[PDB]
Design a protein around this nucleic acid. Structure first.
Ligand code: K
Ligand code: K
Ligand code: K
Ligand code: K
Ligand code: K
Ligand code: K
Ligand code: K
Ligand code: K
Ligand code: K
Ligand code: K
Ligand code: K
Ligand code: K
Ligand code: K
Ligand code: K
Ligand code: K
Ligand code: K
Ligand code: K
Ligand code: K
Ligand code: K
Ligand code: K
Ligand code: K
Ligand code: K
Ligand code: K
Ligand code: K
Ligand code: K
Ligand code: K
Ligand code: K
Ligand code: K
Ligand code: K
Ligand code: MG
Ligand code: MG
Ligand code: MG
Ligand code: MG
Ligand code: MG
Ligand code: MG
Ligand code: MG
Ligand code: MG
Ligand code: MG
Ligand code: MG
Ligand code: MG
Ligand code: MG
Ligand code: MG
Ligand code: MG
Ligand code: MG
Ligand code: MG
Ligand code: MG
Ligand code: MG
Ligand code: MG
Ligand code: MG
Ligand code: MG
Ligand code: MG
Ligand code: MG
Ligand code: MG
Ligand code: MG
Ligand code: MG
Ligand code: MG
Ligand code: MG
Ligand code: MG
Ligand code: MG
Ligand code: MG
Ligand code: MG
Ligand code: MG
Ligand code: MG
Ligand code: MG
Ligand code: MG
Lengths: 91, 59, 101
RNA sequence: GGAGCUGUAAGUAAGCUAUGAUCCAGAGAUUUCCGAAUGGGGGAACCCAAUAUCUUUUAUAGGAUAUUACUUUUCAGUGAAUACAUAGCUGAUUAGAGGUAGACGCAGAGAACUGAAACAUCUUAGUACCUGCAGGAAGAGAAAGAAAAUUCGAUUCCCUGAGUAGCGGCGAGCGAAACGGGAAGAGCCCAAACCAACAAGCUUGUUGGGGUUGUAGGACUCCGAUAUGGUAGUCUGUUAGUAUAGUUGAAGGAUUUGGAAAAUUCCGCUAAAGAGGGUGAAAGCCCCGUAGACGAAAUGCUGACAACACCUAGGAGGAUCCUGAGUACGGCGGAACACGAGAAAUUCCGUCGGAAUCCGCGGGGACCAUCCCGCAAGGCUAAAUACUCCCUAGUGACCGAUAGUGAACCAGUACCGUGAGGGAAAGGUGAAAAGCACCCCGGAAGGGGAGUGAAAUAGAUCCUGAAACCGUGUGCCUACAACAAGUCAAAGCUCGUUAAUGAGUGAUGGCGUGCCUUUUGUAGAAUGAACCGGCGAGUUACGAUUGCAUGCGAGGUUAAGU
RNA sequence: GGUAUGAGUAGCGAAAGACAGGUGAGAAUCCUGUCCACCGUAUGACUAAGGUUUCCUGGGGAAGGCUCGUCCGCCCAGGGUUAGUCGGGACCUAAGCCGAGGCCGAUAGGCGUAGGCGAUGGACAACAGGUUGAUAUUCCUGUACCAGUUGUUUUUGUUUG
RNA sequence: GCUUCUAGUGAGAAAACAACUGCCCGUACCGUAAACCGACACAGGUAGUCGAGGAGAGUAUCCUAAGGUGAGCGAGCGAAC
């Protein structure tokens, strides 16, 4: 897959916003991307230097509307920690 | 559109595609935040990339 | 449909029979159309639509397209529509007089 | 194709479209992962590699694309015991591997309940099931046939023969075939003799020629013509048609009723169109259509035409040669033939034995003779036949939501089950949402107004709205009475009708043990029903027979089929 | 299928609660406080399986909860699971399973060699504290370890190596 | 896995220090349970670890610690059974 397709979007939440204060950035990533790919994708997309990437899988969540019930899509969340002496991401 | 894509050369179409993929990356990020107004742009860009790849294949 | 947005039509059946108006919008999939000043309804709206009183709004409801006959612009009379080729452009002809549209 | 469009699904939002959008049809591109799956593994939709090239990083790690299963066919290369070899091994090449339409076909294997009023033969059945192989059809098919009217001339299927001949614990049952009439029709290639070439160890293989059968044919030897006819050949083009989008397509206005007209009345008109659907009720003339005329860039399919390919010799001679062997056939054991071993021919399977070959061989229901008909042990073959998961257009004295598919509705779903598997319920506001602004009680729910509407006692649990069941009002009766509860007689009171020698209630009096089933006999202390509603049981096909009816009558009548 | 009868009857599932204050339309039943009481080889603390969002936060009170409900493992709306070192894979094998060729067999298939799969066992590198409403040997702080990579300096070996 | 041995493989090796690289899956929560198996927020069933004090042989017993709990109908009355 292309590097520009690995990173889907940022994650903006109370937890991710807090983590930005520590210079780590949460993204939704392609479910098939390993944390090394994410590191490479982040660096090429933002010119930053990445110190560490932590990565989790998010299970699909049960939801219902009216008479219909199903599941939200599975997601893959990558927390990218930038090095010191490095540019930050500005989303 | 298709007319002007067929005018460009192979290298230009490869480059044109990478410019669109980046714009698509930015649009997704602008959509994730409350910063994207013309949300119809995303489909426009996706189909423009599709049109280029279709043309690339029929050459 | 044989009637089109912007057409001048005459209502041939309904409560508003013999009224005339312009087609404000056409609904080909429903075979319905909206005509100015025809089939008005009094709608009891809650004010959640940027109208800070709610009020009872008067709007035009659609009517079936077969209740409307297009008006002959050159003659002012309602007429059935024929399709004759002019300049290679397929156009609507007034069956009654032969005028176009 | 010509004005809207961004599905169901609104809503906001943001957009597209006369530079032609959405939409429609033909042709292409893309087509993640699992799944035969096939690089390896695996608890399907996941994990882990090799090799090559590319890419990321200073680099390792990372990423991309390609190739890599197994067996088969052919070729090449390597290459054991083991001398040459062979096997193995590596690569290439080639082709299969799974799924279905729960149908139709052929083949292997193959029940039982059941019937026989028991039951082992028999029957159910060669059916169900399982498995293999298919093909659009399959199978069969070009006489070692049917016959003995003298003849017919491949096969298949339909009518008939006929419930006949037969088979059968001669029981129950099973049950032909030929002739006759139809549908459809079509015929052909090999093996062998012999000839030629090549290769090998005079034959002994390969190739090509030759040859194809029963009034026997062919080889062979003679002469004589290189014509004439045919085809179940090919992504050979060309052409036409056709399927898959479409275009065009006549003729009505008033009046009365109504919320609305298509109803009504009045006069009109159109019809190669008075099929049908929709539209505010029931429309030939408002809409979609219909009859009719018309249309194809593209891709299929079909038919011709052309091309090309492939088949197609006559007559006379018999000296010799050929004409399917472990075959035919026989014994034994099974099976198939309607035919159950029977007097059992014919066909096949296993086992053993085992021919002739044209002066021959097989069949004509044991067998022999005679006569007649055919020529096995090699293959192929259209049509008439079977079936329909799907596609298109229709049809119905078929269903109309307890029906009709299990499923009209997000159903093979929910739900049940470890699993195979079982398997529901559930349609309707209105013409249009015009889906009740606003007010009032209430936390809300829900109501009351006010509105919308023709109608809301059409307010979404929404058409109609039965019954059981629950309640409110009250005309008459009821607190000394033992009552299948009604019926007949009857005062009093309260009412007034489909106006009838009326209606409701009823003190009191006479008489009186439900319904059904099953029984000699049931109120039965036998059975069944809680109640109400819906659903729920002699039908159809083919045959037999009788009555009635009609037609014809010593005659009556066709079946398949066209 | 609907609705009765029994009935406003049986039952409401092993146990201690009390009061004050609060919240709220409404509270025996929600919150807070106080005392009281119960478990304590546990009714505590972990964790495998199994479940699969039930976790957290903010709202809600139709239904579910055998009463009630302002509350809930319920409903609505948002969020939450971070590891070279933990457990599993890129390590190993047991039982068993699969099985190239192979052997056997009406079909289907059965068995089985090489080769594999397969833990419940073998092997294997970090810990303490802190931090959030919800994760932590995973994040952070401090201090480590294991495998490998690039470079610098230092030594010694270049085919009698 | 590991440790040895040569056979083979070899031009380079090792140490110190500096900088740097290290993938996939699980990791919420319940878990002697109202969140698992029992149709139920059901007196049943559910492997392993830790499991304190006094008296005590003890993980028995009684009462307690850390910690957890008052268990999803109540109010009266104080008949028969
Ligand atoms: K597989
Ligand atoms: K079928
Ligand atoms: K039997
Ligand atoms: K019997
Ligand atoms: K055939
Ligand atoms: K018969
Ligand atoms: K019998
Ligand atoms: K020939
Ligand atoms: K109309
Ligand atoms: K009509
Ligand atoms: K064509
Ligand atoms: K016989
Ligand atoms: K015969
Ligand atoms: K014969
Ligand atoms: K109504
Ligand atoms: K009453
Ligand atoms: K009486
Ligand atoms: K009895
Ligand atoms: K009941
Ligand atoms: K009751
Ligand atoms: K709450
Ligand atoms: K790990
Ligand atoms: K283990
Ligand atoms: K965790
Ligand atoms: K002690
Ligand atoms: K103790
Ligand atoms: K309680
Ligand atoms: K009492
Ligand atoms: K007692
Ligand atoms: Mg992780
Ligand atoms: Mg695979
Ligand atoms: Mg019997
Ligand atoms: Mg017309
Ligand atoms: Mg009329
Ligand atoms: Mg028989
Ligand atoms: Mg014989
Ligand atoms: Mg024999
Ligand atoms: Mg003859
Ligand atoms: Mg055929
Ligand atoms: Mg039904
Ligand atoms: Mg009904
Ligand atoms: Mg049903
Ligand atoms: Mg009514
Ligand atoms: Mg109703
Ligand atoms: Mg007395
Ligand atoms: Mg009295
Ligand atoms: Mg008796
Ligand atoms: Mg009785
Ligand atoms: Mg009695
Ligand atoms: Mg009974
Ligand atoms: Mg009682
Ligand atoms: Mg209790
Ligand atoms: Mg105690
Ligand atoms: Mg104890
Ligand atoms: Mg909670
Ligand atoms: Mg909460
Ligand atoms: Mg309750
Ligand atoms: Mg481990
Ligand atoms: Mg095996
Ligand atoms: Mg095999
Ligand atoms: Mg082994
Ligand atoms: Mg360890
Ligand atoms: Mg926690
Ligand atoms: Mg945890
Ligand atoms: Mg329990």
């Amino acid at each position: 897959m292309e590097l520009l397709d690995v990173i889907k979007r940022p994650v903006i939440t109370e937890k991710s916003m807090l983590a930005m204060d520590e210079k780590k950035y949460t993204f939704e990533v392609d479910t098939r991307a390993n944390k090394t790919l994410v590191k490479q994708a982040v660096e090429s997309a933002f010119d930053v230097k990445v110190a560490n990437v932590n990565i989790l899988n998010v299970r699909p969540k049960f939801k219902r509307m009216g008479k219909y019930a199903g599941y939200t899509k599975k997601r893959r969340k990558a927390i990218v920690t930038l090095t010191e002496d490095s540019k930050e991401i500005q989303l | 559109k298709v007319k002007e894509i067929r005018e460009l050369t192979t290298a230009e179409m490869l480059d044109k595609e990478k410019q669109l993929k980046e714009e698509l990356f930015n649009l997704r990020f602008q959509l994730a935040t409350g910063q994207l107004e013309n949300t119809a742009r995303i489909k426009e860009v996706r189909q423009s990339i599709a049109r280029i790849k279709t043309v690339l294949r029929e050459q | 449909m044989f009637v089109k947005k912007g057409d001048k039509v005459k209502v041939i059946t309904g409560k508003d029979k013999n009224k005339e108006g312009v087609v404000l919008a056409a609904f080909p999939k429903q075979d319905k159309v909206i005509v100015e000043g025809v089939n008005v309804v009094k709608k009891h709206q809650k004010p959640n639509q940027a109208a800070p009183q709610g009020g009872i709004l008067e709007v035009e409801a659609p009517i079936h397209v077969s209740n409307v006959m297009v008006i002959d612009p050159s003659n002012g009379e309602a007429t059935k529509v024929a399709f004759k080729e002019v300049d290679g452009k397929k156009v609507r002809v007034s069956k009654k007089t032969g005028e176009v549209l």
